[PDB]
Amino acid sequence: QFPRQCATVEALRSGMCCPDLSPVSGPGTDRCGSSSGRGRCEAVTADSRPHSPQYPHDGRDDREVWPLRFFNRTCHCNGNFSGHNCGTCRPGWRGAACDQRVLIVRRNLLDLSKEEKNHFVRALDMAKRTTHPLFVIATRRSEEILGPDGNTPQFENISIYNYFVWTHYYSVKKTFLGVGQESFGEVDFSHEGPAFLTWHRYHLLRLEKDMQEMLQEPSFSLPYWNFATGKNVCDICTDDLMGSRSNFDSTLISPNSVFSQWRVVCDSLEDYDTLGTLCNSTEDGPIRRNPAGNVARPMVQRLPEPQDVAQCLEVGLFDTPPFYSNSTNSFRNTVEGYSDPTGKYDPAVRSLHNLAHLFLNGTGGQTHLSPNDPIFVLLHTFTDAVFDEWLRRYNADISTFPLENAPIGHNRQYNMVPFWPPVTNTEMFVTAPDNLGYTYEIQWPS
Numbered sequence: 094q095f096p097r098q099c100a101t102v103e104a105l106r107s108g109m110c111c112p113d114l115s116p117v118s119g120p121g122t123d124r125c126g127s128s129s130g131r132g133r134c135e136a137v138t139a140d141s142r143p144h145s146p147q148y149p150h151d152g153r154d155d156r157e158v159w160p161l162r163f164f165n166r167t168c169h170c171n172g173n174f175s176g177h178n179c180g181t182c183r184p185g186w187r188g189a190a191c192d193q194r195v196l197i198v199r200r201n202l203l204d205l206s207k208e209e210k211n212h213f214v215r216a217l218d219m220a221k222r223t224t225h226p227l228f229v230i231a232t233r234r235s236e237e238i239l240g241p242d243g244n245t246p247q248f249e250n251i252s253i254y255n256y257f258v259w260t261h262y263y264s265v266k267k268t269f270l271g272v273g274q275e276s277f278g279e280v281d282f283s284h285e286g287p288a289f290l291t292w293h294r295y296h297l298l299r300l301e302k303d304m305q306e307m308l309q310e311p312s313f314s315l316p317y318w319n320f321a322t323g324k325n326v327c328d329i330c331t332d333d334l335m336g337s338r339s340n341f342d343s344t345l346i347s348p349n350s351v352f353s354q355w356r357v358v359c360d361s362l363e364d365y366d367t368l369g370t371l372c373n374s375t376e377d378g379p380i381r382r383n384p385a386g387n388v389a390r391p392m393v394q395r396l397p398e399p400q401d402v403a404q405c406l407e408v409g410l411f412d413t414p415p416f417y418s419n420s421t422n423s424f425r426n427t428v429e430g431y432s433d434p435t436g437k438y439d440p441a442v443r444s445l446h447n448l449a450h451l452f453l454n455g456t457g458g459q460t461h462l463s464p465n466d467p468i469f470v471l472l473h474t475f476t477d478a479v480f481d482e483w484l485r486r487y488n489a490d491i492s493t494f495p496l497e498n499a500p501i502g503h504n505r506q507y508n509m510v511p512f513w514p515p516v517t518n519t520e521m522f523v524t525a526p527d528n529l530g531y532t533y534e535i536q537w538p539s
């Protein structure tokens with residue numbers, strides 16, 4: 094979403110989000126750090142290729158051809174510089190010149206020391222309470238983005254972790270067609286399509302970076318949850334970690350965990366989908382979680398088995414037509430969880446990543462809300478570890494990642510919605526240790 098210095102009237106009118114970095118000659122004189130060698134303001138590269146016919150409403154949704162309905166000029170940073178104003182470094186690099194390498198290690202959460210486990214829980218909680226220093230979120234669609242008087246931009250501050258909840262919501266929300274019309278929901282810019290793995294990769298990378306800066310700890314890393322144990326229970330749902338079950342309400346988190354204090358954002362879909370607004374920064378209910386508790390649906394009362402991970406890594410094509418939740422022999426669809434681990438599509442099956450979400454039988458199993466449960470972070474670093482192992486094992490073969498006719502948002506060169514600056518699925522389709530500055534301490538079944 095957008096840097097707060099682009100959420101102004103002047104920026105939104107000009108169509109340009111190219112903020113200053115260190116301007117000594119007055120405003121506008123160091124856009125993108127161009128006085129240094131760090132970058133320049135330039136025209137946005139945005140995918141214009143066709144999408145699947147599932148989405149018939151071309152012209153109605155601000156997420157189409159992202160980010161052109163808000164900005165047509167962005168910062169392009171030179172070399173290994175990066176950031177909205179080119180004031181920081183590409184992933185895996187540090188220093189004033191972005192020339193010193195760093196490689197952080199994402200570890201199994203259960204292998205951390207007692208001091209590390211406590212450091213991670215408190216870091217998450219500080220992120221839930223700390224205002225994001227850079228990004229503000231929209232509360233209205235672009236038509237209304239500048240307010241009632243046309244001079245009051247409809248952006249709100251939001252916390253580091255709630256921003257993480259919001260960008261996921263914005264990517265899955267229904268297309269609003271107008272008051273009294275039923276909003277269109279056969280659309281998803283981050284799921285049920287080839288961009289699932291790369292979208293959630295960037296999502297995690299953005300949170301890890303924000304928390305490194307929040308903590309002033311450059312080597313801080315996001316741990317993962319090996320949910321592929323076949324267990325009856327949530328082995329990270331304990332009060333030194335993500336919270337055990339409350340003894341007073343089986344759907345709430347134990348009051349002896351900080352996460353019982355969290356209040357969720359974006360749970361008011363009936364307001365958003367009928368009035369045409371967007372999720373804002375006002376929190377509401379608490380986290381609901383009830384592992385293995387979906388008695389109406391026995392298939393989601395047990396986690397994926399270890400062999401499910403080994404089987405899905407035997408699927409050699411990243412994705413297969415029609416590049417959707419009913420693709421077969423698609424690695425992306427297998428690990429996302431709409432196929433069984435071998436690749437066989439079945440409308441009734443839910444495996445791996447999907448199975449882990451629904452196992453939680455609560456907030457974590459609802460697409461617009463699930464990042465509100467912080468188990469999301471660890472569920473997705475593990476899903477990303479499977480993806481990273483696939484990228485090594487099959488030499489990052491992007492050839493099946495379609496350039497066109499994928500569901501809207503999922504063309505290979507689409508800018509993943511709504512990340513800023515524009516970032517394509519291709520930029521994330523790389524083995525992480527060599528290219529993104531992190532690796533997983535993990536071993537795979539065989």
Ligand SMILES: *[C@@H]1O[C@H](CO[C@@H]2O[C@@H](C)[C@@H](O)[C@@H](O)[C@@H]2O)[C@@H](O[C@@H]2O[C@H](CO)[C@@H](O)[C@H](O)[C@H]2NC(C)=O)[C@H](O)[C@H]1NC(C)=O
Pocket residue numbers: 105106107108109161162163164165
């Ligand atoms: C680049 O953008 C400018 C600014 O227009 C804004 O860009 C988007 C956020 C979109 O929502 C527009 O409504 C915004 O106005 C464009 O310049 C304006 O173009 C419009 C018509 O497209 C015109 O009515 C205004 O007078 C123009 N104002 C200015 C200051 O230029 C420009 O056309 C865009 N260039 C592209 C898309 O190539």
Ligand SMILES: *[C@@H]1O[C@H](CO)[C@@H](O[C@@H]2O[C@H](CO)[C@@H](O)[C@H](O)[C@H]2NC(C)=O)[C@H](O)[C@H]1NC(C)=O
Pocket residue numbers: 146147415417419
């Ligand atoms: C996967 O699902 C899609 C969407 O349901 C199927 O594609 C077509 O979808 C349109 C609407 O987008 C329907 O009107 C058609 O009936 C579908 N085409 C047909 C049946 O030829 C797609 O066929 C599905 N793929 C499967 C089941 O393998």
Ligand SMILES: *[C@@H]1O[C@H](CO)[C@@H](O[C@@H]2O[C@H](CO)[C@@H](O)[C@H](O)[C@H]2NC(C)=O)[C@H](O)[C@H]1NC(C)=O
Pocket residue numbers: 232361364365370372373374375377
């Ligand atoms: C932030 O979102 C909440 C939830 O949609 C908005 O509050 C709702 O507003 C509608 C009508 O405006 C009321 O009918 C509901 O009672 C409100 N919900 C709650 C939980 O109070 C809120 O107005 C939004 N904030 C802004 C600035 O738009």
Ligand SMILES: *[C@@H]1O[C@H](CO)[C@@H](O[C@@H]2O[C@H](CO)[C@@H](O)[C@H](O)[C@H]2NC(C)=O)[C@H](O)[C@H]1NC(C)=O
Pocket residue numbers: 386387388389390453454455456458459
């Ligand atoms: C959590 O699981 C329970 C079942 O254990 C779900 O409650 C059932 O929901 C279905 C569909 O809405 C109903 O037909 C049943 O009557 C419900 N049973 C009970 C006992 O409530 C519940 O929807 C799940 N919630 C989440 C968020 O996953």
Ligand SMILES: *[C@@H]1O[C@H](CO[C@@H]2O[C@@H](C)[C@@H](O)[C@@H](O)[C@@H]2O)[C@@H](O)[C@H](O)[C@H]1NC(C)=O
Pocket residue numbers: 097100224225226229248249250
């Ligand atoms: C958002 O909040 C602004 C506060 O700006 C800064 O935000 C972080 C970095 C905190 O450290 C805080 O102390 C800082 O002052 C307000 O000025 C403003 O009301 C809000 N702006 C918008 C666009 O909503």
Ligand SMILES: [Zn+2]
Pocket residue numbers: 135169
């Ligand atoms: Zn360039």
Ligand SMILES: [Zn+2]
Pocket residue numbers: 261283284293
């Ligand atoms: Zn998701």
Ligand SMILES: [Zn+2]
Pocket residue numbers: 446450473
């Ligand atoms: Zn998920």
